[PDB]
Design a protein around this ligand. Sequence first.
Ligand SMILES: NC(=O)c1ccc[n+]([C@@H]2O[C@H](COP(=O)([O-])OP(=O)([O-])OC[C@H]3O[C@@H](n4cnc5c(N)[nH+]cnc54)[C@H](O)[C@@H]3O)[C@@H](O)[C@H]2O)c1
Ligand SMILES: NC(=O)c1ccc[n+]([C@@H]2O[C@H](COP(=O)([O-])OP(=O)([O-])OC[C@H]3O[C@@H](n4cnc5c(N)[nH+]cnc54)[C@H](O)[C@@H]3O)[C@@H](O)[C@H]2O)c1
Ligand SMILES: [Zn+2]
Ligand SMILES: [Zn+2]
Ligand SMILES: [Zn+2]
Ligand SMILES: [Zn+2]
Lengths: 374, 374
Amino acid sequence: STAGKVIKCKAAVLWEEKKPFSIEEVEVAPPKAHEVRIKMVATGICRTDDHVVSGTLVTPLPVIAGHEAAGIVESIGEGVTTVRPGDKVIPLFTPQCGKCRVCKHPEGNFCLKNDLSMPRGTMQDGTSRFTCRGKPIHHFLGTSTFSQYTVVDEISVAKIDAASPLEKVCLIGCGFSTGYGSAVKVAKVTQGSTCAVFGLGGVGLSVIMGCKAAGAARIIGVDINKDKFAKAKEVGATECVNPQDYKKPIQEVLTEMSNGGVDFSFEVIGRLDTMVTALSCCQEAYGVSVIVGVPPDSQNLSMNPMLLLSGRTWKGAIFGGFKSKDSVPKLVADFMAKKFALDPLITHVLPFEKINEGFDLLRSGESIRTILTF
Amino acid sequence: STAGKVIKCKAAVLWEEKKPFSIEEVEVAPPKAHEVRIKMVATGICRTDDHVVSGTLVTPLPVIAGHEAAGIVESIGEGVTTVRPGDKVIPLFTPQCGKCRVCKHPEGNFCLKNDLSMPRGTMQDGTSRFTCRGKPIHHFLGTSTFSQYTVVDEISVAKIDAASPLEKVCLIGCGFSTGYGSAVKVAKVTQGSTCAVFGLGGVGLSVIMGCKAAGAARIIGVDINKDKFAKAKEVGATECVNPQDYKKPIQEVLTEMSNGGVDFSFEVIGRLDTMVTALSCCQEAYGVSVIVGVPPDSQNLSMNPMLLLSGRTWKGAIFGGFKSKDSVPKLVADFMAKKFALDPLITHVLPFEKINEGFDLLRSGESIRTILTF
Ligand SMILES: NC(=O)c1ccc[n+]([C@@H]2O[C@H](COP(=O)([O-])OP(=O)([O-])OC[C@H]3O[C@@H](n4cnc5c(N)[nH+]cnc54)[C@H](O)[C@@H]3O)[C@@H](O)[C@H]2O)c1
Ligand SMILES: NC(=O)c1ccc[n+]([C@@H]2O[C@H](COP(=O)([O-])OP(=O)([O-])OC[C@H]3O[C@@H](n4cnc5c(N)[nH+]cnc54)[C@H](O)[C@@H]3O)[C@@H](O)[C@H]2O)c1
Ligand SMILES: [Zn+2]
Ligand SMILES: [Zn+2]
Ligand SMILES: [Zn+2]
Ligand SMILES: [Zn+2]
């Protein structure tokens, strides 16, 4: 009975940077051609959502953020062929249009239809499906999952297993897949290798999971918050180091510990300095460093290109290098077959109405992932 | 006989930066254990040798430079097993000790015994075999080929085909192998791809050769000296562009030409700005950029890490990624079997006594490789 009609529902609207979200009524338009309207079931709080609040990641405001989620299709627009009403789905913050040069490339995943490189905060057609207080509200990464209902382009949604536990598999929509893929797909961690992981939040823990799945012999976790170390060891870290404990720069410490540099390093924080440190700590001739963290808007790092000339490889990726629509359903199926665990990432559960408390938990350092239930 | 005796011979000594080489008599000590004394036959002038002169590459002075060469073994020290008097050899400016973690790694070539990272200007034992006017003279990269005779460590020499033309295959000691391997081994250029090569000197031409051998469909040469374009097209460039001809930055031009960025780019100059440009012009999701040029001493570049986060790979390499002692004899065998050409790189052939004139031809833009013959 809601098909083709505007839905009034609650969402978490961000009117201004550095302010709490406002939980209030919004109007959600019905889906246009090749659009899908989704009743959200669960959404995670990723640090990237906090970057919108802090102005680390610039996107137009006011906005409905959220990009790590799962829900159930309420209705489909004309021409949709890949999902149906009642299907469980994960919104894809990295689309997979299937048609652009990146989607056609065997190793590309950062589809040209993304809204991350130069955010406009719209649907693919350049418009918004959201109104609040009579004012248009921006989308975020084509997903806008901090709402009881959202509308996404068909290229930004994947159908998943009907028996999936949505309160767990929402993490496949960002943090798990990103970290795990950064290890297994992007870095291609090898059996017996030594890895260093900078940042032990939900994404860095997922990197550790992937490095352990790939057979690394040593996985060194690096965080300035020693409270993060116990869970990092639970999921595979062999040792953890806090840069604040040492007189020398941590790249020197890690080089010493690894008898000349690590095989694979990962920056999973979002700081320019730790991007350079993570590069430096990998072995100069054959090391690989992967940037995963989101940098502060418009800022440049400084580095000595001799770090690369000796043989290092430096790369980054979005969403763990996974082609999103192909990969998300497979990841869910693998989760259902117990090929990896998600519970270690989930430290807190809250109702959606307590979103601000969920952000407080992230900012205090206490949580990994809080899962919000609608 | 000269074996076991000091040899007095002619060499080109660099007494201070930014001055001509001094062509004069030096004394060359006999080889100690695990050392090899070589009568030089031909040596190329590589831009890296000019970097010593210009202070772009810091190494202890006074020095006998030269690292791209070929000669004939005059004598061997105790314990040498890999070459014998009379053998044709190429000195290896990147050693292959066979024992270090890099040598044992399948993809590493920048052996830890190298003298490039932290140049000492000596033999492996920390001493010099050269004196001039009563003063000790430094080695360069364990090779020092601007001399009628040199002494190298065994790990810094490879035996090559006895029928090799040394006046050509000396280029396998640096510029050919570096450029060719940077394409075929480090970048792993693919069939049908689009490449951009920044800098069309001897090394950049060799990159083009490798890109063509790997089956690239398009190879765009980039140089500010349009006189370099004809030879670049002869060896495989499909297009050449001069940044000075355009109102827009050349990364934008190249991105437009390639309908969204190139598959592979190469920086083969040694400038910070062109390293960043070359990275930027590769496709943001799956492009690869390789730094080959030697940067100016102690200078850092500035870049936006979103260039990497989207999916680019940035790497550099010494000597085309080739394990030097394994690879050099095979490259020479391949040359003998007509698998690649060296003549396109050779624009001038001068007696050794004309070393300064050879450097002037490089600096003026007029040469690719000058081969000096002893
Ligand atoms: N590339 C992608 O597709 C992608 C996906 C998801 C998240 N991200 C980014 O990845 C980063 C991590 O996200 P998350 O795991 O949700 O965040 P998080 O939970 O905030 O974890 C970051 C961790 O970094 C630690 N940290 C902060 N500063 C330092 C320091 N100087 N040295 C060492 N550790 C430090 C911090 O204590 C925390 O445990 C953020 O920048 C996200 O925006 C990127
Ligand atoms: N990585 C290695 O193992 C390795 C080996 C050999 C050479 N090198 C370095 O590679 C670089 C090239 O050596 P080479 O081919 O002998 O030098 P080269 O013959 O001087 O060629 C350099 C080319 O760059 C061109 N150039 C200069 N400035 C610009 C600019 N702003 N934009 C575009 N083109 C420009 C110039 O006109 C010339 O044709 C040097 O920095 C060497 O030191 C590195
Ligand atoms: Zn696409
Ligand atoms: Zn995220
Ligand atoms: Zn070695
Ligand atoms: Zn050279």
